[PDB]
């Protein structure tokens, strides 16, 4: 009887409505990423859909800068509004400081925005989690921003329906500073071990940066190598 409003705690002291937005994230497809020797990558599972769909607009990975990028999971409407807010906040940070100096308060803008809606009635939260990744003045960054707004810097994570299984794999297999290729194949194995039996891993979008370089997205045949 308490899980109807965003502004009511429970006898344990729980915000169920926030947790149900977190459950809405869990219905999205798995997307992971990690940092390595001079840079970070991102991997995102895509169960291949209608060939009528222009492939340009089903990419869960999105460029928020030449030097910051992210991936979502959850509601697609809220997901797109969020990556829009990430882009606009990157531009505001870049115009007030001359450059996106550190990725952290880009994600703070996004995080405070997502947090505020977990507090006021008449508003629902965003049912999306986001994984940011890029290069700044400090180096490789990797965050995750959840529906409640909580951000944490990682060396590897996932989001989506697999998230527990992927972080379980990476929790016992990931070793830092892998050269890019070896890192990618480790992350592919991580993504593989989150599916159910009988499911064949289709082609997932994967993209990376190294320190001093810009973004690139591996096209489908460079992806096709690690199948």
């Amino acid at each position: 009887a308490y899980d109807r409003a965003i502004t009511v705690f429970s006898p344990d002291g729980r915000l169920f409505q926030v947790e149900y937005a977190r459950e809405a994230v869990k219905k999205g497809s798995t997307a992971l990423g990690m940092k390595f020797a001079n840079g970070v990558l991102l991997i995102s599972d895509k169960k291949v859909r209608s060939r009528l769909i222009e492939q340009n607009s089903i990419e869960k990975i999105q460029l928020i800068d030449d030097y910051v990028a992210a991936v979502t999971s959850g509601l697609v409407a809220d997901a797109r509004v969020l990556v829009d807010f990430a882009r606009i906040s990157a531009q505001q940070e870049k115009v007030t400081y001359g450059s996106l100096v550190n990725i952290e308060n880009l994600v703070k803008r996004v995080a405070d925005q997502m947090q505020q809606y977990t507090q006021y009635g008449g508003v629902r939260p965003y049912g999306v989690s986001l994984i940011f990744a890029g290069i700044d003045q400090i180096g490789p960054r990797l965050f995750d921003c959840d529906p409640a707004g909580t951000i944490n810097e990682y060396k590897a994570t996932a989001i989506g329906s697999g998230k527990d299984a992927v972080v379980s794999f990476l929790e016992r297999e990931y070793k830092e500073n892998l050269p890019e290729k070896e890192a990618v194949t480790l992350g592919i194995k991580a993504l593989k071990s989150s599916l159910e039996e009988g499911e064949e891993l289709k082609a997932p979008e994967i993209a990376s940066i190294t320190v001093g370089n810009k973004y690139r997205i591996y096209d489908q045949e460079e992806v096709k190598k690690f199948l």
């Binding site: 959850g74 509601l75 697609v76 409407a77 997901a79």
Partner: protein, 219 residues
């Protein structure tokens, strides 16, 4: 594997089985109900144009026994065919959730209607305990007939009794139980046609209690 057992249930009792039951009800069951109703009509007047004595307490009316047995076999067949539709709907009741129960409520409503059908198809004596509708006879028609008749036959045969109201009570057992048969067939016609309506309008939500295209919304 669990999904294998669920699919093993659903492939075994499927929608074509339930709709074959609905087709059999829509044609044959209804004319058989009507034929037993007309037989009850004729037997009631056959009892009505008569005056009884001790000799009618010495032999059971085999025509009335046959009418009761036909109605009893009809109720058995209608009960088993209703249980078929019950199983078809009940093996497709989905995972219990606090929302998304729109088509689940359709399943509970149609199962509630089939409950009414088989609670007025299953048999009962005069229970004298319920405040609702007293159930027309059901399965125990020939049982209740022979019990209530055998009591009066014991009282009439023994020396025997001298109550003329007891003899006319035997006559009223005969006429009244045929009357109850024809009342019961009229109400079973009503109820069967209601269940046919309910299935033929609700079968889509009965088989698919919820439709999922969440990948359009959740990606």
């Amino acid at each position: 594997k669990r999904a294998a057992l669920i699919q093993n249930l659903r492939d075994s009792y499927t929608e074509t089985s339930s709709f074959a039951v609905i087709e059999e009800w829509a044609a044959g069951t209804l004319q058989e109900i009507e034929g037993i109703a007309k037989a009850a009509v004729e037997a009631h007047g056959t009892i009505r144009n008569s005056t009884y004595g001790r000799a009618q307490a010495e032999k059971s009316p085999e025509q009335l026994l046959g009418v009761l047995q036909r109605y009893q076999d009809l109720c058995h067949n209608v009960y088993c065919q209703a249980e078929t539709i019950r199983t078809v709907i009940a093996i497709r009741i989905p995972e219990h959730k606090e929302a998304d129960n729109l088509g689940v409520a359709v399943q509970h409503a149609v199962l509630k209607v089939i409950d009414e059908l088989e609670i007025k198809t299953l048999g009962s004596g005069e229970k004298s305990g319920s405040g609702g509708a007293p159930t027309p006879i059901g399965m125990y028609a020939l049982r209740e007939y022979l019990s209530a008749r055998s009591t009066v036959e014991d009282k009439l045969l023994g020396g025997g009794s001298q109550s003329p109201s007891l003899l006319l009570e035997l006559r009223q057992i005969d006429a009244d139980f045929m009357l109850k048969v024809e009342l019961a067939t009229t109400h079973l016609s009503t109820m069967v046609r209601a269940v046919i309506n309910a299935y033929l309008l609700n079968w889509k939500k009965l088989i698919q209690p919820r439709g999922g295209h969440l990948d359009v919304l959740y990606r």
